[PDB]
């Protein structure tokens, strides 16, 4: 069976403008494992992004974590862009500053 | 309080393209300590206490143990694939194996095979055989069952070799593995004319198991009043969690967040 990824974007600590933080994008519950994840800064794919090791849960679904060090501002917008075989076009989830 | 050690294997076949993919991981008490690639074929460490050079006595057999499993996994992958009459197709095979030691040293082991993301074969040590989770797994089950020696060796690994490796790991692990760091608890909010959304976050904590709940007037709220917590990882080996509560503006003060974690001496209660 194929499973579409669940996407969650959040910060390491509650966002405080000018204060260093981490933007995380956790993809999980998907199958097969071939997945491509991008962190976006105002539409611009961010480079120098880290990721945990591909792993999977009891139900055999896979989960991967993507994260980058970063300092937010008021003009800055962040999101996570995910594409998987179960998805027609890339899906984009915006980073809600409250998360 | 019991302890665990389990390995995770994953790999994929290629559409008529020979060879496959592969990668293994080792966890002790749900803490990832070892990574293994096939592309690089190198055994990397994932924690400070279990390093390549740092106490490299174990890193030797552990690096052997995985290369061995790699071969076995490959053989198994081919066996399972060929027993489905699968070739020009692309498939995946995942394995999970490990042991669970109790406070009393009594061990419980397991070995499970997942094919194309679904349960397929599961080792049943007690009966020295395998459970086929679906019809198409029986041919393989029958193959592995032709000579009990395979089951015997397999069980021997799960009941002897594995626990011994767990003990040895729990050794160079003391001080870091059992180390628990409590969460920083913060209650943020998002206010609007119609409703205020309270958010309670538990940050940079470990181990992952935690307890978070809302209190109305210093008293517990029926669990069915707020979705259960959400637990997420940070890349650094710590975790965070959060719960949400929608309340009428003004009433914020009547709600407090209560968080419990072994790292905390007693339940921690935070105001909005």
PDB file of N, CA and C in Angstrom, chain B residues 18 33 38 46 61 66 94 99 115 121 159-160 185 190 195 201-203 206 219 229 241 247 250 253:
ATOM      1  N   UNK B  18      18.953  -4.131 -11.782  1.00  0.00           N
ATOM      2  CA  UNK B  18      19.581  -4.987 -10.792  1.00  0.00           C
ATOM      3  C   UNK B  18      19.899  -4.266  -9.494  1.00  0.00           C
ATOM      4  N   UNK B  33      21.651   4.854  18.233  1.00  0.00           N
ATOM      5  CA  UNK B  33      23.071   4.871  18.511  1.00  0.00           C
ATOM      6  C   UNK B  33      23.927   4.492  17.320  1.00  0.00           C
ATOM      7  N   UNK B  38      24.688   1.408   2.708  1.00  0.00           N
ATOM      8  CA  UNK B  38      25.182   0.390   1.800  1.00  0.00           C
ATOM      9  C   UNK B  38      25.946   1.180   0.747  1.00  0.00           C
ATOM     10  N   UNK B  46      25.905   7.490  16.432  1.00  0.00           N
ATOM     11  CA  UNK B  46      24.826   8.458  16.548  1.00  0.00           C
ATOM     12  C   UNK B  46      24.700   9.065  17.941  1.00  0.00           C
ATOM     13  N   UNK B  61      32.547  -5.745  16.525  1.00  0.00           N
ATOM     14  CA  UNK B  61      31.533  -6.762  16.260  1.00  0.00           C
ATOM     15  C   UNK B  61      30.222  -6.122  15.794  1.00  0.00           C
ATOM     16  N   UNK B  66      26.214  -5.868  11.595  1.00  0.00           N
ATOM     17  CA  UNK B  66      25.432  -5.202  10.558  1.00  0.00           C
ATOM     18  C   UNK B  66      25.789  -5.660   9.142  1.00  0.00           C
ATOM     19  N   UNK B  94      11.326  -4.319   4.658  1.00  0.00           N
ATOM     20  CA  UNK B  94      11.730  -3.722   5.919  1.00  0.00           C
ATOM     21  C   UNK B  94      11.774  -4.812   6.962  1.00  0.00           C
ATOM     22  N   UNK B  99      15.310  -7.231  21.091  1.00  0.00           N
ATOM     23  CA  UNK B  99      14.934  -7.938  22.304  1.00  0.00           C
ATOM     24  C   UNK B  99      14.545  -6.940  23.378  1.00  0.00           C
ATOM     25  N   UNK B 115       6.840  -6.300   3.846  1.00  0.00           N
ATOM     26  CA  UNK B 115       7.043  -6.282   2.406  1.00  0.00           C
ATOM     27  C   UNK B 115       6.125  -5.260   1.744  1.00  0.00           C
ATOM     28  N   UNK B 121       5.966 -11.493   7.230  1.00  0.00           N
ATOM     29  CA  UNK B 121       6.364 -12.668   7.973  1.00  0.00           C
ATOM     30  C   UNK B 121       6.777 -12.221   9.355  1.00  0.00           C
ATOM     31  N   UNK B 159      17.428 -14.544  22.039  1.00  0.00           N
ATOM     32  CA  UNK B 159      17.426 -14.824  23.468  1.00  0.00           C
ATOM     33  C   UNK B 159      18.767 -14.797  24.160  1.00  0.00           C
ATOM     34  N   UNK B 160      19.833 -14.865  23.379  1.00  0.00           N
ATOM     35  CA  UNK B 160      21.172 -14.872  23.944  1.00  0.00           C
ATOM     36  C   UNK B 160      22.017 -13.706  23.451  1.00  0.00           C
ATOM     37  N   UNK B 185       8.446  24.593  29.973  1.00  0.00           N
ATOM     38  CA  UNK B 185       7.041  24.714  29.631  1.00  0.00           C
ATOM     39  C   UNK B 185       6.596  26.156  29.433  1.00  0.00           C
ATOM     40  N   UNK B 190      -3.198  33.014  21.149  1.00  0.00           N
ATOM     41  CA  UNK B 190      -3.583  33.705  19.929  1.00  0.00           C
ATOM     42  C   UNK B 190      -4.987  34.186  20.204  1.00  0.00           C
ATOM     43  N   UNK B 195     -12.679  34.009  20.010  1.00  0.00           N
ATOM     44  CA  UNK B 195     -12.083  32.933  20.795  1.00  0.00           C
ATOM     45  C   UNK B 195     -10.600  33.153  21.005  1.00  0.00           C
ATOM     46  N   UNK B 201       3.395  24.376  25.342  1.00  0.00           N
ATOM     47  CA  UNK B 201       4.508  23.663  24.745  1.00  0.00           C
ATOM     48  C   UNK B 201       5.514  23.178  25.771  1.00  0.00           C
ATOM     49  N   UNK B 202       6.025  21.975  25.549  1.00  0.00           N
ATOM     50  CA  UNK B 202       7.023  21.387  26.429  1.00  0.00           C
ATOM     51  C   UNK B 202       8.214  21.316  25.494  1.00  0.00           C
ATOM     52  N   UNK B 203       9.312  21.973  25.860  1.00  0.00           N
ATOM     53  CA  UNK B 203      10.465  22.018  24.964  1.00  0.00           C
ATOM     54  C   UNK B 203      11.769  21.398  25.392  1.00  0.00           C
ATOM     55  N   UNK B 206      13.620  15.107  27.232  1.00  0.00           N
ATOM     56  CA  UNK B 206      14.027  13.737  26.923  1.00  0.00           C
ATOM     57  C   UNK B 206      14.082  12.897  28.197  1.00  0.00           C
ATOM     58  N   UNK B 219      -8.455  22.557  38.460  1.00  0.00           N
ATOM     59  CA  UNK B 219      -8.926  21.177  38.469  1.00  0.00           C
ATOM     60  C   UNK B 219      -8.871  20.535  37.096  1.00  0.00           C
ATOM     61  N   UNK B 229      -1.796  15.260  23.397  1.00  0.00           N
ATOM     62  CA  UNK B 229      -0.597  15.982  22.977  1.00  0.00           C
ATOM     63  C   UNK B 229      -0.112  15.539  21.603  1.00  0.00           C
ATOM     64  N   UNK B 241       6.549  18.916  22.747  1.00  0.00           N
ATOM     65  CA  UNK B 241       5.165  18.537  22.615  1.00  0.00           C
ATOM     66  C   UNK B 241       4.250  19.712  22.855  1.00  0.00           C
ATOM     67  N   UNK B 247     -10.735  28.768  24.120  1.00  0.00           N
ATOM     68  CA  UNK B 247     -11.593  29.281  25.188  1.00  0.00           C
ATOM     69  C   UNK B 247     -12.161  30.684  24.896  1.00  0.00           C
ATOM     70  N   UNK B 250     -11.197  36.300  27.717  1.00  0.00           N
ATOM     71  CA  UNK B 250     -11.498  36.745  29.064  1.00  0.00           C
ATOM     72  C   UNK B 250     -11.259  35.607  30.040  1.00  0.00           C
ATOM     73  N   UNK B 253      -7.395  33.127  32.087  1.00  0.00           N
ATOM     74  CA  UNK B 253      -6.917  32.909  33.447  1.00  0.00           C
ATOM     75  C   UNK B 253      -7.448  31.645  34.129  1.00  0.00           C
TER      76      UNK B 253
END
